[PDB]
């Protein structure tokens, strides 16, 4: 984002407040736009944004989109008990595959990884 008077800034989402914009805030924003020499968004563009938000909020996600969002949050997932159990089970399956294939090098790494992940309370 960017203030008109100030410069560009990268901000996270939680900084924004759910409270509505007050009259002096919008007036100060208009004064900053006039100082920089900019205009306000057109009413046609305002309606286009409103229709875009309503369509996006009322949209129905597809299976592929839902899986992509789930994979994205799984990449963001630091830890979750169900997911840790599933990962440990998958690692155990990979470990038995490596043991049955007589691969003495992979199995040590999988055992070390399981030891690091494990030791619950």
């Amino acid at each position: 984002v960017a203030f008109p008077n100030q410069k560009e800034m990268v901000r996270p989402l939680f900084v924004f407040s759910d409270s509505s914009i007050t009259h002096p805030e919008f007036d100060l924003f208009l004064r900053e736009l006039d100082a920089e020499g900019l205009s306000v968004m057109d009413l046609r563009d305002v309606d286009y944004k409103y229709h875009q938000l309503k369509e996006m909020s009322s949209r129905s996600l597809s299976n592929d989109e839902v899986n992509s969002i789930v994979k994205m949050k799984q990449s963001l997932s630091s830890n979750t008990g169900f997911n840790t159990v599933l990962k440990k089970a998958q690692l155990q399956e990979e470990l038995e595959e490596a043991r049955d294939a007589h691969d003495h090098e992979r199995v040590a790494r999988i055992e070390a990884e399981l030891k690091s992940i494990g030791a619950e309370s």
Partner: peptide
């Protein structure tokens, strides 16, 4: 081409909960 009023901006309020 008309300027946007306060109510027009209020129609497109997108809260932090809505962002999440």
């Amino acid at each position: 081409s008309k300027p946007a009023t306060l109510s027009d901006i209020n129609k497109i309020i997108f809260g932090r909960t809505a962002m999440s």
